[PDB]
Amino acid sequence: ATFEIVNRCSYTVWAAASKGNAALDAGGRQLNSGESWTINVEPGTNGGKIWARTDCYFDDSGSGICKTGDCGGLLRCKRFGRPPTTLAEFSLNQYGKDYIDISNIKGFNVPMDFSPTTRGCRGVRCAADIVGQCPAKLKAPGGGCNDACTVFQTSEYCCTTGKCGPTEYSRFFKRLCPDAFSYVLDKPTTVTCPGSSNYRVTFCPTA
């Protein structure tokens, strides 16, 4: 499946793509403002994610740091990124269908749209100014708006045992972005697409 990753932000981002234990495609790349990078994701990929990283520095070998979404210091991500990270999440060719969503469960750094480029389903979007509106206690000094699990490490926020409810913090994310997961047990906003759909992830869609 193809995923065109487009940076419409006025700032550079370093796109990342992983399924948690492996890179998807090259796993990451710099995207200056306006640039597009198309990756190929294998059919059947379960639990894939794409995200933006901000404020990165990499040496010639691709080792370095980012202020949001760092993945072990690698330009080329092999694992998931450090919160806060707005997440485009997908599982492909799952009994004939693809499933996509956006999640704020790991916080928010960059606004995104995640849409099919092929027919048969709608896209999802979280493009409100969550960083600007972020509750004081969730603001990450390194940049972005942390989720409450990251900040407070409680069973309730982290949904550790599977029984949690919405919270004042989750409700903030949900108010700003109704179409994204705000906590682990949120009413799902997953979209079912035809198996083997192709997609576009756009950072700063309303830039």
Amino acid at position 87, single letter: L
Integer CA distances (angstroms), 60 to 15, 22, 37, 88, 167, in order: 18, 22, 20, 28, 44
Spatial contact of 81 and 73, defined as CB atoms under 8 Å apart: no
Which ranges of 49-167 does DSSP label H, i.e. alpha helix? Answer: 130-133, 148-152, 155-158
Put residue 109 in one of left, alpha, beta given phi > 0 → left and psi -120 to 50 → alpha: alpha
- Provide the resolution (angstroms): 0.9
Spatial contact of 72 and 48, defined as CB atoms under 8 Å apart: no
Rounded CA-CA distance 116/199 in Å is 4
Rounded CA-CA distance 36/42 in Å is 20
Structural domains in the chain, sorted by start: 1-207 (2.60.110.10)
Which ranges of the chain does DSSP label H, i.e. alpha helix? Answer: 130-133, 148-152, 155-158, 168-176
Taking 3-state DSSP, the helix, strand and coil percentages for the chain, each rounded to the nearest 5, stand at: 10, 40, 50
Integer CA distances (angstroms), 41 to 5, 44, 95, 162, 202, in order: 12, 9, 17, 30, 17
Integer CA distances (angstroms), 30 to 40, 90, 163, 166, in order: 16, 22, 39, 36
Whether residue 84 has a cis bond before it, omega within 30° of 0:
yes
- Elucidation method: X-ray
Decide the pairing of beta strands 36-40 and 87-94.
unpaired
> Who contacts 59 (Cβ-Cβ below 8 Å, separation ≥6)?
none
